[PDB]
């Protein structure tokens, strides 16, 4: 498969919106396996992110933070290995996305079935729905001994229920294609 190298920018503000998006597009276009951390930060509402759509594996951690963009197209992401972790604890960190209102509306991690190491931190995403419905224990791998969670569900909009097609009312978004594969 096509591999790319990840970043280690964490929450630092980029030097320029243009050079930032250009760097991410050139890094991840066509990429399937990120050998490193997938950090997606400070992206504005009009950001074109189709270049992420082939990512299937992240070897480090995924950080989605300080974005106004309403969707992040990671529907093909199947595994986060967590060989590096955000704050040495979290394999998936979704932070401060927000503030039509800006801000991530759904995670839409339809293919995510395994986190091998590290936990899940979801904080201060005022338009984010459904993150409380996910059974994270079905995603943490059996040898993941940092399977800790903090899922902030405070939000500023009312969420429509998971699709009635979804078993156990667990979903990554409103669509019947967004049910959690359990």
């Amino acid at each position, epitope marked *: 498969t096509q591999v790319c190298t990840g970043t280690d920018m964490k929450l630092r503000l980029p030097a320029s919106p243009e050079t930032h998006l250009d760097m991410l597009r050139h890094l991840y276009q066509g990429c399937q396996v990120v050998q490193g951390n997938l950090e997606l930060t400070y992206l504005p509402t009009n950001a074109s992110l189709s270049f992420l759509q082939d990512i299937q594996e992240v070897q480090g951690y995924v950080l989605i933070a300080h974005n106004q963009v309403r969707q992040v197209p990671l529907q093909r992401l199947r595994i986060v290995r967590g060989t590096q972790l955000f*704050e040495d604890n979290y394999a998936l960190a979704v932070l401060d996305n927000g503030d039509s209102p800006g801000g991530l509306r759904e995670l839409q991690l339809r293919s995510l079935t395994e986190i091998l190491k590290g936990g899940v931190l979801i904080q201060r995403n005022p338009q984010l729905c459904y993150q409380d419905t996910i059974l994270w224990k079905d995603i943490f791998h059996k040898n993941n001994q940092l399977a800790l969670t903090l899922i902030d569900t405070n939000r500023s909009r009312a969420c429509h229920p998971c699709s009635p097609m979804c078993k156990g009312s667990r979903c990554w978004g409103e669509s019947s294609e967004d049910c959690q594969s359990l």
Partner: antibody
Amino acid sequence: EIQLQQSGPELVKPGASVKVSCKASGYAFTSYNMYWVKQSHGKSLEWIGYIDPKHGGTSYNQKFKGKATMTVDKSSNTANMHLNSLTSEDSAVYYCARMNYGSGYAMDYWGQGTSVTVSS
Amino acid sequence: NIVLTQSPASLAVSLGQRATISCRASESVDSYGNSFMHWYQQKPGQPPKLLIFLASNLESGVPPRFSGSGSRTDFTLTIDPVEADDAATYYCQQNNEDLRTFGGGTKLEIKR
């Protein structure tokens, strides 16, 4: 040197709640997870859960879900464990212990234990 | 849940002899080239103290009379030579899964 200083022994009535505190010093408190562990008298050690002080992520033993709640107070470098709805079977020594990532998540520094007596 | 079974539950060893304590796990505690097995000493009325981490690593400050060996489902703590200060209960503990579990403990009586 690293020290974990726990609050003193507690006498609590059945049905009440108790707060056990664990004050950390000698290292960066928010850089390490904190384990909580139960030991009934003459029995083995049981894992209750662990917490990340920096962002508050937690992992609980299912056996203690809803008996124990872990929190931190960063300003005082303190981890706290609240035990609720107490029964005779909750009378035990409760320990906090630091998680060491490099040492395979071993419990490398322990508090001195807080003895809780549940009784009328 | 990985169940840890320590053997023997108690033993009496004289000063200068070797003490051997075994920890048998119900399934492998190995992953990513690590054995996630640790050993602790608990004297009566005290907290446990870490002796050995990751099956064979001696914790800094612990006397080299203590050693750990083993892999997969079978681990051993050796104390050689036994000294009076070793009177204590010894526990193994694993974290190859998020659910941490401990052995039932082995009580070491010093034979004088």
